[PDB]
Amino acid sequence: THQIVTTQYGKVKGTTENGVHKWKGIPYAKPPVGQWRFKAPEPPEVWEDVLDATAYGPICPQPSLPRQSEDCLYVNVFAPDTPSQNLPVMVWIHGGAFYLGAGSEPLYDGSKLAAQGEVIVVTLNYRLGPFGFLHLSSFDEAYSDNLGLLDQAAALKWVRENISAFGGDPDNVTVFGESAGGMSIAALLAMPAAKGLFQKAIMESGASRTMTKEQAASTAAAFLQVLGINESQLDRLHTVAAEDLLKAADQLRIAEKENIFQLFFQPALDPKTLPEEPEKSIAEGAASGIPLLIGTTRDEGYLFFTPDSDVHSQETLDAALEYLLGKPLAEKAADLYPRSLESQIHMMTDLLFWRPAVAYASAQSHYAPVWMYRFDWHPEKPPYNKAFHALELPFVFGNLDGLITDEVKQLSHTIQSAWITFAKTGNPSTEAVNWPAYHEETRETVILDSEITIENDPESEKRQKLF
Ligand SMILES: [Zn+2]
């Protein structure tokens, strides 16, 4: 029971606390530093001793107490201390607009989920910002685009090859994630690099999201300009200080011509790594047979705009609509968002989260079981009376400190129970809710709140206008 486990690269020793075995800081790839910067993840060098896996590894460098370093490719494992073997495995992919976050953030501690559901929970870090979503393929074929996604895939491959040694079932892996993590999963469900790496998926407030191959190249060129590196000095991309990359990143990202509706960092179309839009691939059966639990919060947009924040600018406003819907649809939908704070908030909720989620769920419904939800809960009294983006996270993980009444603990039990039953069976039904399958004829949706309810074809008027 001292928890020494042999991974394919060497032994690691975790610890046991409050009924949960824990291993933190397990390397799953060679540190992507120096010559390995901007290249696909490689296997880490094997070690012959026993790694004290009781502390989180560094997180990927990002704008800001945890240590940061490009040497950040680590996974963490939480398993229940029970005689039960071959357990379902839930792999978490954190969000953060592709330039923020870490699998080791307190909110994602998997101890409670592991103990309550008797499942294994894996958290991980993947390259972010200029390290993981700066696509340099146009400059050197040796470089890979969508590095952050490749890292996630490598972590999933690590799970497939090593989780049995930790007591998990590599054939019952559920990948789940929120925001950028949900958008990442949208891509992983279709990407060549992630084929066969998981059997179920949960997409929270995030779906198909990509930038064009052309845009990726444009941004890449702008980055090198700021760095003062031309096409005959690419060697310097491997010796330049990480801080210089972070500096260039913030400079370009915060540029006046940049807005929240158009993510500066995000997956990019690329023949080698992500050939086409995830949604399109799914619509053609790329994720056949993979059950999908997907949803959004009712008031997503209120997290990005405050009562006294910037108010539109039809210029950049109409540009957002065309970018998110295409010129033809943008014109037909313009009517829904008359310039105003309210409209920009609704644009965020509807076009960055809701429409993508419904489009993805609809596409997948023709190839696998799909279950859709909308999270409505929030305190009644202002100023926190909105089902803000990410508000369901504390409930999913059972880590409620971020918010604790009995109703809060009750809602967390209801939500976490469904996530657990889904990981185990592919159906999120529990004693508290018989979850109806989502398909295009009825669009039955579960409404998560203190009291569970079901809405058939919710916001149908908005659906007809946006589709
Ligand atoms: Zn032992």
Residue 154's SS3 state is helix
Do residues 38 and 26 touch, judged by C-beta distance below 8 A?
Answer: no
* CA–CA distance, 208 with 93 (Å, rounded to integer): 15
Q: Which amino acid is at 321?
A: L
Contact residues for 8 (Cβ-Cβ < 8 A; gap 6+): 158, 161, 162
Contact residues for 367 (Cβ-Cβ < 8 A; gap 6+): 282, 285, 287, 288, 289
DSSP state, residue 142: T
DSSP state, residue 89: E
β 74-80/292-297 pair status? unpaired
Q: Could you tell me how far CA 466 lies from the centroid of its own chain?
A: 24
What would the two tokens of residue 358 be? Answer: 């419904």
221-230 LR contacts (CB < 8 Å, sep 24+): 221/138, 222/252, 223/130, 223/134, 223/248, 223/249, 223/252, 224/139, 226/251, 226/252
Report resolution (Å) to 1 decimal. 1.5
Distance between Cα 5 and ligand 1 center (Å): 9
* CA–CA distance, 301 with 345 (Å, rounded to integer): 5
Q: Hunting for tokens 């959004």 — which residue is that?
A: 296
Tell me the domains of the chain and their CATH numbers: 1-467 (3.40.50.1820)
**Cross-strand partners of 445:** 372, 455
What would the two tokens of residue 188 be? Answer: 């992983």
Residue 281's SS3 state is helix
Q: Hunting for tokens 């491997």 — which residue is that?
A: 238
* CA–CA distance, 391 with 95 (Å, rounded to integer): 13
Determine the length of the chain: 467
* CA–CA distance, 24 with 168 (Å, rounded to integer): 16
Q: Which residues surround ligand 1, an ion (CB under 5 A)?
A: 1-2
Distance between Cα 454 and ligand 1 center (Å): 48
Query: Distances from the Cα of 263 to the Cαs of 48, 158, 244, 254, 329, in angstroms?
Result: 43, 29, 21, 11, 20
* CA–CA distance, 389 with 443 (Å, rounded to integer): 22
Q: Hunting for tokens 């592991």 — which residue is that?
A: 114
Do residues 346 and 360 touch, judged by C-beta distance below 8 A?
Answer: no
- Other Cβ atoms less than 10 A from the Cβ of 374: the count is 19
Helix (H) or strand (E) holding 188: helix 180-188
Q: Hunting for tokens 């971020």 — which residue is that?
A: 402
Do residues 283 and 310 touch, judged by C-beta distance below 8 A?
Answer: no
Distance between Cα 13 and ligand 1 center (Å): 10
* CA–CA distance, 428 with 373 (Å, rounded to integer): 11
Contact residues for 292 (Cβ-Cβ < 8 A; gap 6+): 200, 201, 202, 203, 360, 361, 364, 368, 369, 370, 371
400-408 LR contacts (CB < 8 Å, sep 24+): 401/106, 402/107, 407/450
Query: Distances from the Cα of 286 to the Cαs of 8, 59, 77, 156, 195, in angstroms?
Result: 29, 32, 29, 18, 9
DSSP state, residue 169: E
Distance between Cα 2 and ligand 1 center (Å): 3
Residue 105's SS3 state is coil
Distance between Cα 170 and ligand 1 center (Å): 22
- Other Cβ atoms less than 10 A from the Cβ of 264: the count is 21
Q: Is the peptide bond before 66 cis (omega within 30 degrees of 0)?
A: no
What would the two tokens of residue 21 be? Answer: 């075995």
Burial of 28 (0-12, 13-18, 19+ CB in 10 A): buried
* CA–CA distance, 216 with 297 (Å, rounded to integer): 30
What would the two tokens of residue 247 be? Answer: 């500096």
- Sheet of strand 10-13, all strands in order from the earlier edge strand to the far edge: 4-7, 10-13, 50-52
**Cross-strand partners of 6:** 11
Catalytic residues: 179, 300, 389
Distance between Cα 157 and ligand 1 center (Å): 26
Distance between Cα 1 and ligand 1 center (Å): 3
Name the nearest CA neighbour of 208 among 280, 289, 156, 146.
280
Distance between Cα 221 and ligand 1 center (Å): 53
* CA–CA distance, 291 with 120 (Å, rounded to integer): 19
Name the nearest CA neighbour of 149 among 267, 300, 22.
267
* CA–CA distance, 217 with 276 (Å, rounded to integer): 16
Output the CA torsion 324→328→334→335 (10° steps): -140
Q: Hunting for tokens 């007591």 — which residue is that?
A: 167
* CA–CA distance, 105 with 463 (Å, rounded to integer): 36
Kindly write down the DSSP assignment for every residue of 64-75, as one continuous string.
----B-S---EE
Backbone angles phi, psi at 243, to 5 degrees: -65, -30
Method of elucidation:
X-ray
